[PDB]
Backbone as CSV, one residue per row, in Angstrom:
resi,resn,N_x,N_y,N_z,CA_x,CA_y,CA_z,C_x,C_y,C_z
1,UNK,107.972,115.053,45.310,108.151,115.328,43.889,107.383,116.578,43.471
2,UNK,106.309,116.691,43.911,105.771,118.094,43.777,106.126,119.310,44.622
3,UNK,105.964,120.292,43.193,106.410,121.633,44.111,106.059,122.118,45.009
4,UNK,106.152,123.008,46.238,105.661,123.746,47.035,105.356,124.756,46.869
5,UNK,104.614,125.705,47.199,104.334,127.445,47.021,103.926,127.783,48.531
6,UNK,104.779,128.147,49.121,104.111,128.994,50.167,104.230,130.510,50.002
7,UNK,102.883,131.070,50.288,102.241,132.181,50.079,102.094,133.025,51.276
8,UNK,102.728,134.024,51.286,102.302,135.235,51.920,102.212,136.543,51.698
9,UNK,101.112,136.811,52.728,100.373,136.873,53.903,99.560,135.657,53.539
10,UNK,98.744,135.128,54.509,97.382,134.355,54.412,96.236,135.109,54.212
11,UNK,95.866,136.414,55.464,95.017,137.725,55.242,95.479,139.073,55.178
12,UNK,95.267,139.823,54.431,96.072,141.184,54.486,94.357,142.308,54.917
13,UNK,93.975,143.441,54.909,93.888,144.586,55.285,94.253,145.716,54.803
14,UNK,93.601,146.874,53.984,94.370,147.633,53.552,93.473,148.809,53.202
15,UNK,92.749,150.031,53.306,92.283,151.135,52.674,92.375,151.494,51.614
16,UNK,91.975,152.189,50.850,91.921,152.628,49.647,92.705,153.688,49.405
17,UNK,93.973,153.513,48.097,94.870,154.268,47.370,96.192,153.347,48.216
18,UNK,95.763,152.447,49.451,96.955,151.908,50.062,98.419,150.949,48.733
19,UNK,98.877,150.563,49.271,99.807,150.130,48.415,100.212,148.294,49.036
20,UNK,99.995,146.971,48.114,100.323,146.065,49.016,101.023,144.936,47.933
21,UNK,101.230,144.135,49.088,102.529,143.381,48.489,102.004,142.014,48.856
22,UNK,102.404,140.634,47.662,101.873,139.457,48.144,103.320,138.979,47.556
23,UNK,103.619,137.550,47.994,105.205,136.963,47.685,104.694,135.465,48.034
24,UNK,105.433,134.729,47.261,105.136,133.391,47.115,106.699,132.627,46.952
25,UNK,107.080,131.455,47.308,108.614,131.386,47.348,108.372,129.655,46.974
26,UNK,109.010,129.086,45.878,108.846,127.858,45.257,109.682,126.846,46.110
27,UNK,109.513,125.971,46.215,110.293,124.391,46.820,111.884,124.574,46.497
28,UNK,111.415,124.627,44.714,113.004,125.024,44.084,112.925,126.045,43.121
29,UNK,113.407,125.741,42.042,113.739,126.504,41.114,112.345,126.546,40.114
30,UNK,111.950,127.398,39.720,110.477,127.311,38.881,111.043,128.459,37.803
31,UNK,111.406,129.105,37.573,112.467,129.687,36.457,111.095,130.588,35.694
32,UNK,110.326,131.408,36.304,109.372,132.666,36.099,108.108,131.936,35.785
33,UNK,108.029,130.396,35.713,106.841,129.752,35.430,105.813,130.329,36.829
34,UNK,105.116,131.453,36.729,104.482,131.694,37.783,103.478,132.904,37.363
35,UNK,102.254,132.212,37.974,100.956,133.305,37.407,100.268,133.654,38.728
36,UNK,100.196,135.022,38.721,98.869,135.368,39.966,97.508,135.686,39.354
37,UNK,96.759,134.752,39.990,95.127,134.832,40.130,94.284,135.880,40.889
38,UNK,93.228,136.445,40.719,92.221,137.024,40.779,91.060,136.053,41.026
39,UNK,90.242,135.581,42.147,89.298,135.045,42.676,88.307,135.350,43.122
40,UNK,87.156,135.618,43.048,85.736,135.808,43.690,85.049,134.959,43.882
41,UNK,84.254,134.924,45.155,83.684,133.052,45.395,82.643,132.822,44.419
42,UNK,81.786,133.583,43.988,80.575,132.989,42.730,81.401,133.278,41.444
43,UNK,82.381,133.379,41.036,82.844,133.600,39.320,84.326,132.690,39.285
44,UNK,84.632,132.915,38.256,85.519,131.903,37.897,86.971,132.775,37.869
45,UNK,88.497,132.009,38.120,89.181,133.224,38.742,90.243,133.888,37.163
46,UNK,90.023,135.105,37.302,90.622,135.863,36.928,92.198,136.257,36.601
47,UNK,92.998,135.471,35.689,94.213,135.403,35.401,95.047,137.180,35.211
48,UNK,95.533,137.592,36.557,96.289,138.825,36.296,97.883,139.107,35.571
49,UNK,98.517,137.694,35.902,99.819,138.235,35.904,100.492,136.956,35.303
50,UNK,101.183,136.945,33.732,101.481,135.780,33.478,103.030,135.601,33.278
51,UNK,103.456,134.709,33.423,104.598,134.116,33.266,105.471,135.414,34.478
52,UNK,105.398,135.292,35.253,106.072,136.298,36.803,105.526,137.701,36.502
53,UNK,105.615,138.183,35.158,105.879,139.354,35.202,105.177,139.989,33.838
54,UNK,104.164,139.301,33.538,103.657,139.505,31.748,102.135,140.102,32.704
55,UNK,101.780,140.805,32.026,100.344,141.589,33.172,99.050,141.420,31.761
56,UNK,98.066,140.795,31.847,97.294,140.513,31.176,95.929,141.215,30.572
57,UNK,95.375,141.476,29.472,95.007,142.631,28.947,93.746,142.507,29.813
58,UNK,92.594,143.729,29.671,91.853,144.091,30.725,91.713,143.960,32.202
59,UNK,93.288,143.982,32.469,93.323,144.275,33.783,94.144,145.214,34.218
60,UNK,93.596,146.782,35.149,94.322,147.675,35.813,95.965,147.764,35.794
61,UNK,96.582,148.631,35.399,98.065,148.799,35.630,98.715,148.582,36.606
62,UNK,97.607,148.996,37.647,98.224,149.336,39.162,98.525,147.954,39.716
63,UNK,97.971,146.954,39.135,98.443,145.540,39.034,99.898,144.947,38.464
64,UNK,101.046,144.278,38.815,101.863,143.755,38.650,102.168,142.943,39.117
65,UNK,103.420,141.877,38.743,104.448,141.025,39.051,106.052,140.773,38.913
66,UNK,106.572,140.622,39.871,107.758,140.541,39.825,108.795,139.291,40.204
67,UNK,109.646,138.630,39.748,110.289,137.365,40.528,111.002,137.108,39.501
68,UNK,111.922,135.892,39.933,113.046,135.178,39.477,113.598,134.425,39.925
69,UNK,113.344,132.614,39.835,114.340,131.614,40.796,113.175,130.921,41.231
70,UNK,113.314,131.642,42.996,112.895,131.246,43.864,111.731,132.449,44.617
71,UNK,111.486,133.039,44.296,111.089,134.420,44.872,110.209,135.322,43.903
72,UNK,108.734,135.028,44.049,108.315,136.202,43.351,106.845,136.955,44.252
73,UNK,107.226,137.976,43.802,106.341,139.055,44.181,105.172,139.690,43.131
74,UNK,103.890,139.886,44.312,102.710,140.416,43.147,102.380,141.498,44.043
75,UNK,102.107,142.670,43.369,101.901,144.237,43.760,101.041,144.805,43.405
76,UNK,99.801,144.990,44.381,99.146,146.506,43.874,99.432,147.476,44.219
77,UNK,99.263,148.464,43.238,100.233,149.845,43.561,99.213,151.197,44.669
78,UNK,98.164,150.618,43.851,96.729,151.721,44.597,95.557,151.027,44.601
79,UNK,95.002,150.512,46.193,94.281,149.739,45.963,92.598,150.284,46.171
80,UNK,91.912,149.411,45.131,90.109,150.111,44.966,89.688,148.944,45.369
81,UNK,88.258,149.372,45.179,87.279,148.395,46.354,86.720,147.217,45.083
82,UNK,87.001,147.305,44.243,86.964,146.688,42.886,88.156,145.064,43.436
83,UNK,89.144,145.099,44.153,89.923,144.381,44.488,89.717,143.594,45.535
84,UNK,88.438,143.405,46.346,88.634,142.784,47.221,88.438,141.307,46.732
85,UNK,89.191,140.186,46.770,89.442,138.891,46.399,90.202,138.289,46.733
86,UNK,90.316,136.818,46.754,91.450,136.051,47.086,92.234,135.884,45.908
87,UNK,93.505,136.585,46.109,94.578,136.185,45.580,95.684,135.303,45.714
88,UNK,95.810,134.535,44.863,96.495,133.538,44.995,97.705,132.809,43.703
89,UNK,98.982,132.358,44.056,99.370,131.946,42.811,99.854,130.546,42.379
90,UNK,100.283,130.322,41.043,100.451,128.597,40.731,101.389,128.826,40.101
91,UNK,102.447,128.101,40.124,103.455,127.307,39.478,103.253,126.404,38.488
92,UNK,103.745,126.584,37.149,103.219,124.931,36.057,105.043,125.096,35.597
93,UNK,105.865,124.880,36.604,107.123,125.005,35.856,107.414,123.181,36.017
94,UNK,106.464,122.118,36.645,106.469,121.105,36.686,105.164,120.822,37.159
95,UNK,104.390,119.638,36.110,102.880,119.253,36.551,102.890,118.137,37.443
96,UNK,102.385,117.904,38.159,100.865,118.708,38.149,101.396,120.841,38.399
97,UNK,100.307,120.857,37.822,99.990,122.258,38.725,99.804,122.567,40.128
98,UNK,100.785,123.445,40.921,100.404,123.531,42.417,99.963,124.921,42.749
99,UNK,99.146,125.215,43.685,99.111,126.580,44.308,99.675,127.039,45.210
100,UNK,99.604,128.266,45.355,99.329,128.508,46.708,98.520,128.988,47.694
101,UNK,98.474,128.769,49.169,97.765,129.081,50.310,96.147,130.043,49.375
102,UNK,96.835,131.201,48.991,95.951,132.262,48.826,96.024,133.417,49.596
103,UNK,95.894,134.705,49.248,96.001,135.800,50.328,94.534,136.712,50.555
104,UNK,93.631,136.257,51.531,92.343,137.166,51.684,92.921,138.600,51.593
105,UNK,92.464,139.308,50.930,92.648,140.635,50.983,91.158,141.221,51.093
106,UNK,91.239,142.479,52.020,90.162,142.905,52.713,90.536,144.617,52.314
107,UNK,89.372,145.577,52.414,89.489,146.898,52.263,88.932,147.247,54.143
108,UNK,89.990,147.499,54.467,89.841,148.497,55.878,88.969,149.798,56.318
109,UNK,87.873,149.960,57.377,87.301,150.519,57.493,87.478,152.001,58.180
């Protein structure tokens, strides 16, 4: 009865000004009910991207979301060292609330 979210990547890798892509794909139909998070392990997480595609005030442009259905995508366009966090997203298009996996994202040396 509850939804699924599987999330990918699990860990990504990436340098600075790089460009990256996270995608999350629902059980069924979740109809844009879908937010990506911003996480750091000592603070509380950081709501970037609301309803698939609504991008939330004091946070970077270079931040987005995209989806519809079954399929959505979250994008940074140029990435800073300001970003390293687990990102991750939830579905409330039926409660409970579910997540997903999460994607470690790392800045490459």
């Amino acid at each position: 009865a509850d939804i699924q979210m599987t999330q990918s990547p699990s860990s990504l890798s990436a340098s600075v000004g790089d460009r990256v892509t996270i995608t999350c794909q629902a059980s069924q139909d979740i109809i844009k009910y879908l937010n990506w998070y911003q996480q750091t392990p000592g603070k509380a997480p950081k709501l970037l991207i609301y309803e698939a595609s609504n991008l939330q005030a004091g946070v970077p442009s270079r931040f987005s979301g995209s989806g519809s259905g079954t399929d959505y995508t979250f994008t940074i366009s140029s990435l800073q060292p300001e970003d390293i966090a687990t990102y991750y997203c939830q579905q409330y298009q039926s409660l409970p609330k579910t997540f997903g996996q999460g994607t470690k994202l790392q800045i490459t040396r």
